[PDB]
Write a protein that binds this ligand. Structure first.
Ligand SMILES: N[C@@H](Cc1c[nH]c2ccccc12)C(=O)O
Ligand SMILES: [K+]
Ligand SMILES: [K+]
Ligand SMILES: [K+]
Ligand SMILES: [K+]
Ligand SMILES: [K+]
Ligand SMILES: [K+]
Ligand SMILES: [K+]
Ligand SMILES: [K+]
Ligand SMILES: [K+]
Ligand SMILES: [K+]
Ligand SMILES: [K+]
Ligand SMILES: [K+]
Ligand SMILES: [K+]
Ligand SMILES: [K+]
Ligand SMILES: [K+]
Ligand SMILES: [K+]
Ligand SMILES: [K+]
Ligand SMILES: [K+]
Ligand SMILES: [K+]
Ligand SMILES: [K+]
Ligand SMILES: [K+]
Ligand SMILES: [K+]
Ligand SMILES: [K+]
Ligand SMILES: [K+]
Ligand SMILES: [K+]
Ligand SMILES: [K+]
Ligand SMILES: [K+]
Ligand SMILES: [K+]
Ligand SMILES: [K+]
Ligand SMILES: [K+]
Ligand SMILES: [K+]
Ligand SMILES: [K+]
Ligand SMILES: [K+]
Ligand SMILES: [Mg+2]
Ligand SMILES: [Mg+2]
Ligand SMILES: [Mg+2]
Ligand SMILES: [Mg+2]
Ligand SMILES: [Mg+2]
Ligand SMILES: [Mg+2]
Ligand SMILES: [Mg+2]
Ligand SMILES: [Mg+2]
Ligand SMILES: [Mg+2]
Ligand SMILES: [Mg+2]
Ligand SMILES: [Mg+2]
Ligand SMILES: [Mg+2]
Ligand SMILES: [Mg+2]
Ligand SMILES: [Mg+2]
Ligand SMILES: [Mg+2]
Ligand SMILES: [Mg+2]
Ligand SMILES: [Mg+2]
Ligand SMILES: [Mg+2]
Ligand SMILES: [Mg+2]
Ligand SMILES: [Mg+2]
Ligand SMILES: [Mg+2]
Ligand SMILES: [Mg+2]
Ligand SMILES: [Mg+2]
Ligand SMILES: [Mg+2]
Ligand SMILES: [Mg+2]
Ligand SMILES: [Mg+2]
Ligand SMILES: [Mg+2]
Ligand SMILES: [Mg+2]
Ligand SMILES: [Mg+2]
Ligand SMILES: [Mg+2]
Ligand SMILES: [Mg+2]
Ligand SMILES: [Mg+2]
Ligand SMILES: [Mg+2]
Ligand SMILES: [Mg+2]
Ligand SMILES: [Mg+2]
Ligand SMILES: [Mg+2]
Ligand SMILES: [Mg+2]
Ligand SMILES: [Mg+2]
Ligand SMILES: [Mg+2]
Ligand SMILES: [Mg+2]
Ligand SMILES: [Mg+2]
Ligand SMILES: [Mg+2]
Ligand SMILES: [Mg+2]
Ligand SMILES: [Mg+2]
Ligand SMILES: [Mg+2]
Ligand SMILES: [Mg+2]
Ligand SMILES: [Mg+2]
Ligand SMILES: [Mg+2]
Ligand SMILES: [Mg+2]
Ligand SMILES: [Mg+2]
Ligand SMILES: [Mg+2]
Ligand SMILES: [Mg+2]
Ligand SMILES: [Mg+2]
Ligand SMILES: [Mg+2]
Ligand SMILES: [Mg+2]
Ligand SMILES: [Mg+2]
Ligand SMILES: [Mg+2]
Ligand SMILES: [Mg+2]
Ligand SMILES: [Mg+2]
Ligand SMILES: [Mg+2]
Ligand SMILES: [Mg+2]
Ligand SMILES: [Mg+2]
Ligand SMILES: [Mg+2]
Ligand SMILES: [Mg+2]
Ligand SMILES: [Mg+2]
Ligand SMILES: [Mg+2]
Ligand SMILES: [Mg+2]
Ligand SMILES: [Mg+2]
Ligand SMILES: [Mg+2]
Ligand SMILES: [Mg+2]
Ligand SMILES: [Mg+2]
Ligand SMILES: [Mg+2]
Ligand SMILES: [Mg+2]
Ligand SMILES: [Mg+2]
Ligand SMILES: [Mg+2]
Ligand SMILES: [Mg+2]
Ligand SMILES: [Mg+2]
Ligand SMILES: [Mg+2]
Lengths: 17, 271, 46
RNA sequence: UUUAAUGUUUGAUGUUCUAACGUUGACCCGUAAUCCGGGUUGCGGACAGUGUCUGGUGGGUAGUUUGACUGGGGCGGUCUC
RNA sequence: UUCCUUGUCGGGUAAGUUCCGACCUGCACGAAUGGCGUAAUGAUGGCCAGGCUGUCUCCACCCGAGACUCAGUGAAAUUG
RNA sequence: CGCCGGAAGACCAAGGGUUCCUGUCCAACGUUAAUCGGGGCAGGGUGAGUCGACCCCUAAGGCGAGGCCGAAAGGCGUAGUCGAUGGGAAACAGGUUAAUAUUCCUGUACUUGGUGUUACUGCGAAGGGGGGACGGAGAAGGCUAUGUUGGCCGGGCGACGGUUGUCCCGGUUUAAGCGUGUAGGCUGGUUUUCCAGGCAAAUCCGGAAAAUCAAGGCUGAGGCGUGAUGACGAGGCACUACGGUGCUGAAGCAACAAAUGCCCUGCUUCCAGGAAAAGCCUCUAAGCAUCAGGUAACAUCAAAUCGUACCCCAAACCGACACAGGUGGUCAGGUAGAGAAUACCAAGGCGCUUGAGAGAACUCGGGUGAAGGAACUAGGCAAAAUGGUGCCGUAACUUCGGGAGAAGGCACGCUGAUAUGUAGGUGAGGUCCCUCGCGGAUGGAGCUGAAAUCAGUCGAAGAUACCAGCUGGCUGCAACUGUUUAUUAAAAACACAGCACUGUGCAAACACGAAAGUGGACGUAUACGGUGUGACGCCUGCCCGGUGCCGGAAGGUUAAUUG
RNA sequence: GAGGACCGAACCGACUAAUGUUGAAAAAUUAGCGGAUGACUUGUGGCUGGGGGUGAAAGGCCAAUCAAACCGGGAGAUAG
């Protein structure tokens, strides 16, 4: 199955650039 | 006659159309029609080999006589017709024996005119003679390159060739591009110019008018990515390189003629 | 919305049928591999 | 050292020629056929074109490289005696 | 496109880092990788006004579907 | 009682494959129970000369004897042969099963072949000609499907004031075929002679000439007659397993309105200039000639095979699900309305496979709100507001088209009169004429029917519900309509008409291919490819030192080769 | 009676907000929104194949996968 969308979403995931 | 359209729409503002009222309003002559289905620019491998070709209006092919080898028999012009396959107009002629043929309509020719091909015809627009029987200096069209092969040069609307000299078995022509070419004197040519000389004065006016002629959009190479075009790429609008074709060959100046077996027939290249 | 499988028996037979496998050398090797494996259905036919 | 003559030619350029070769010119036949082949003829003609060898060009395409130390990496500096 | 910079002057506001007009000191505009204008057009960007309003001052009440209780069926992520 | 009704109704194609109908069972399946079911088990059910496939004919395209090309495998392609989404013969109405019906039954039809008899006779193709055979938009006329009202027929006299009438309810249907040839559309007709054309021939097609006639021919919806002394028919009567079954059966007309359907593959007009082949008609060649063959009438025989149940905007197809998603075509009733929008309804079909209570916070979808009115916020986000027809009126700017529905304003219901229903539309009877019929002129009965003015009247409100633009001022960017990141970006990005440079003389440049070949193009420099810019207006200045490209040939350097 | 003309249903699309986010749905619903005779839209069939196609150009799309598809093999690649 595909992963949870919130784990895909760049805004949520990449929060600490 | 060129007529400007009235700006009742933004797509009508710049339209200029060439309307000829002497054309035949009716169906073409059926026995001289063929099927002519479109390609899309694709060869027998299925691949696009010429870009920006596709769609357009359905067309039928008119079997035009480019040889004009029905010698000795006079023919009267019946009508002028529209041809969707070329820029010039075509005229339907009727021979004395009862045969009908299409020809390229020369300039100034009307319905009822008399034409005649052969070696002993008269020097008037519409008649086809071997170029050894045509005066030096004459304006001809529909010129042959090989005797009996058919006319190939000066076919499209308004074009013509001038006979500059005749020395031996060859005649020197001044082609419409400005090139001086030698052609043997047994090849045929038709007197006069090709009609419809204001075909170039028309303005399509909108983007859909080019799509009615089977012309699809051109994307600029500088607007692509580097994987697509040598010009592709950039953060903003960059260029920074010599202009080339999509296959890396220099455009804008670089000559591409390499034909060593026809260089002897070319007196002077165009300039 | 529209999914990827839109069935059509004519396009199913013209693409993966028996007469279409038997037409090329590579299609006859697909049939030799499936007979060697022992499959109950060689091609997708009637 | 230096030249001219005769005989012979080699290499260069030029001029014609036809018979190899080309023909996406015309006609005839296989043939109920815009493929192909054969025949006649015209136009080119030892050119073009192809093979082997060879110089140039060649991000069109391919395989790769692009150091370490370092009060984080980069930049700067340094690397042996 | 201007870093310094919310440059300076004028307009609009009681008060305007945005907006409009002008100045020229253009860090670092500029003529077909176009310059300057431009009627019409745009689910395009910025600003102002009239109308309108629970957007707000500041929330109140009401009508339905859940949440709550009863009977039947009955999951999930996680977990030394 | 509620919901849909341009569907959530009906019929199919694609796809599925027994889900169809009947009996029986309730373990599992159904988001609960289940006596029920698209679930389990058993039995039954799909009937064709005319519908569809198969069949004949072809398009794009596929395969491809020889052939051309290629280390091999293979690629391309001629003659051919396949390939529908297109062209090609013929059936309708009624009745019937639990479940099929244009297939079964009743009635009435039609098509194509084979054979035989009779009568007459130039038949014959792998060839020639015709035909089939074709675009977009627009306009109008003639019609029908269909609807409404009247008439006619059957029934009724009303749970509560009135209801023997200008009252209420229901019905008023009928096909293909055959005959006639009308509104409309196209076209001159006939005869004779001759001819460098249609690969040969031709009486056919094309061309030329002459004579003569004022008409002929082709096509064509609808109507009318017949089909039909039939069928159907509101109801009524007689039985019943109360599901249903049997018998009989009245009227069955007219006017008006009217399509997006038909005449119409028509007509008018525009440019972007709009399939192929066979069936069909005709001409002849080789050939055959008291043959064979052709034409007409009659009789007779044949028309095989496969599909046919059921669902098909869906619980049966594609989505793992009985999943708020997706899915091509056909049919198209009433009132209001411009309308296939919208509201309420008919035929028809449904209430969405958990319910019962309670009436906390909070969440979701909505209704209303004192005074204020953007003070909210990144930002008037979201809400609120505007909203129709007719008429008056409307600025800067402009490419003279626009801007513009600018802005803003007024009227709007019902009743009566003008006018017992007007202007307009339709048009019976009667009369006259002829061409005696689907004809013309006159005539006006009946039916239908806006819009306006005047007067009166009700409410707070008359575009009363549903439905239905917020408007204005300044400015950046892109000319404009379009296109794009399927699934966080619709934009100032891409495209564009226009402009410029450049390559290309035809076996074109260029592109796909070890090649043959193909596209470019059955085009020919007013054409084609590549690059940049991007409507239009005013314009586009200086630099050739660098890199690139174009031209040059003296000299220097310089490969294989030779030795 | 022209028009890549205007308003607006079918049809094609996807600008804003709210809901949903172990969803009714691995991209939808509701209320608004754009085009709506054209560079339109749609059915059936066909052709182009992986360093290849196609692309009004976003590295977009090529079976819920794309700066190099999927399946099988080299293969137990190599992994300071
Ligand atoms: N959140 C939304 C949209 C979404 C789907 N897939 C995603 C992947 C990444 C981010 C968001 C999404 C949903 O669940 O329907
Ligand atoms: K024909
Ligand atoms: K472009
Ligand atoms: K760029
Ligand atoms: K020769
Ligand atoms: K050579
Ligand atoms: K250190
Ligand atoms: K540190
Ligand atoms: K700047
Ligand atoms: K002020
Ligand atoms: K101020
Ligand atoms: K501009
Ligand atoms: K926009
Ligand atoms: K703007
Ligand atoms: K059970
Ligand atoms: K369920
Ligand atoms: K078909
Ligand atoms: K024939
Ligand atoms: K004739
Ligand atoms: K059936
Ligand atoms: K409660
Ligand atoms: K409106
Ligand atoms: K857009
Ligand atoms: K773009
Ligand atoms: K050019
Ligand atoms: K061609
Ligand atoms: K220079
Ligand atoms: K320079
Ligand atoms: K230079
Ligand atoms: K119009
Ligand atoms: K219209
Ligand atoms: K299509
Ligand atoms: K790949
Ligand atoms: K897949
Ligand atoms: Mg191009
Ligand atoms: Mg261009
Ligand atoms: Mg880009
Ligand atoms: Mg590159
Ligand atoms: Mg830049
Ligand atoms: Mg020679
Ligand atoms: Mg590289
Ligand atoms: Mg390696
Ligand atoms: Mg380091
Ligand atoms: Mg450091
Ligand atoms: Mg100020
Ligand atoms: Mg602010
Ligand atoms: Mg300013
Ligand atoms: Mg700039
Ligand atoms: Mg610059
Ligand atoms: Mg420049
Ligand atoms: Mg400007
Ligand atoms: Mg737009
Ligand atoms: Mg419970
Ligand atoms: Mg568990
Ligand atoms: Mg875990
Ligand atoms: Mg079953
Ligand atoms: Mg059932
Ligand atoms: Mg149960
Ligand atoms: Mg069922
Ligand atoms: Mg069952
Ligand atoms: Mg069962
Ligand atoms: Mg082939
Ligand atoms: Mg081998
Ligand atoms: Mg066939
Ligand atoms: Mg049934
Ligand atoms: Mg024919
Ligand atoms: Mg009728
Ligand atoms: Mg009675
Ligand atoms: Mg009575
Ligand atoms: Mg009473
Ligand atoms: Mg009644
Ligand atoms: Mg044929
Ligand atoms: Mg399914
Ligand atoms: Mg499903
Ligand atoms: Mg599954
Ligand atoms: Mg359900
Ligand atoms: Mg569903
Ligand atoms: Mg649909
Ligand atoms: Mg509706
Ligand atoms: Mg009903
Ligand atoms: Mg209580
Ligand atoms: Mg509540
Ligand atoms: Mg209030
Ligand atoms: Mg108030
Ligand atoms: Mg504020
Ligand atoms: Mg504040
Ligand atoms: Mg809003
Ligand atoms: Mg003003
Ligand atoms: Mg004006
Ligand atoms: Mg105006
Ligand atoms: Mg107005
Ligand atoms: Mg600004
Ligand atoms: Mg734009
Ligand atoms: Mg995306
Ligand atoms: Mg996106
Ligand atoms: Mg978006
Ligand atoms: Mg070009
Ligand atoms: Mg640009
Ligand atoms: Mg300049
Ligand atoms: Mg040079
Ligand atoms: Mg429009
Ligand atoms: Mg899209
Ligand atoms: Mg949306
Ligand atoms: Mg919506
Ligand atoms: Mg709109
Ligand atoms: Mg619209
Ligand atoms: Mg719309
Ligand atoms: Mg178009
Ligand atoms: Mg994908
Ligand atoms: Mg790779
Ligand atoms: Mg491993
Ligand atoms: Mg290995």
């Amino acid at each position: 199955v595909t992963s949870k969308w919130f784990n895909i979403d760049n805004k949520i995931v990449d929060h600490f650039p | 006659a060129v007529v400007k359209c009235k700006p009742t729409s933004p797509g009508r503002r710049h339209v200029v159309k060439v309307v000829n009222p002497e054309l035949h309003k009716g169906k073409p002559f059926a026995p001289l029609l063929e099927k002519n289905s479109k390609s899309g620019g694709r060869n027998n491998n299925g691949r696009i080999t010429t870009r920006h070709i596709g769609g357009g209006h359905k067309q039928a092919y008119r079997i035009v006589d480019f040889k004009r080898n029905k010698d000795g028999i006079p023919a009267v012009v019946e009508r002028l017709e529209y041809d969707p396959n070329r820029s010039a107009n075509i005229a339907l002629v009727l021979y004395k024996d009862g045969e009908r043929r299409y020809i390229l309509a020369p300039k100034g020719l009307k319905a009822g005119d008399q034409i005649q091909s052969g070696v002993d015809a008269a020097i008037k627009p519409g008649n086809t003679l071997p170029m050894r029987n045509i005066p030096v200096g004459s304006t001809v069209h529909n010129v042959e390159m090989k005797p009996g092969k058919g006319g190939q040069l000066a076919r499209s609307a308004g074009t013509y060739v001038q006979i500059v000299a005749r020395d031996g078995a060859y005649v020197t022509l001044r082609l419409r591009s400005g090139e001086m070419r030698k052609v043997e004197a047994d090849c045929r040519a038709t007197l006069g110019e090709v009609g419809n000389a204001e075909h170039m004065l028309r303005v399509l006016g909108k983007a859909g008018a080019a799509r009615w002629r089977g012309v699809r959009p051109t994307v600029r190479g500088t607007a692509m990515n580097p994987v697509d075009h040598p010009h592709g790429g950039g953060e903003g609008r960059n260029f920074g390189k010599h202009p080339v074709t999509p296959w890396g060959v220099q455009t804008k100046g670089k000559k591409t003629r390499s034909n060593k077996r026809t260089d002897k027939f070319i007196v002077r290249r165009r300039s | 919305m529209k999914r990827t499988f839109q069935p059509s028996v004519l396009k199913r037979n013209r693409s993966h049928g028996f007469r279409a496998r038997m037409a090329t050398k590579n299609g006859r090797q697909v049939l030799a591999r499936r007979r060697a494996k022992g499959r109950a259905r060689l091609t997708v036919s009637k």
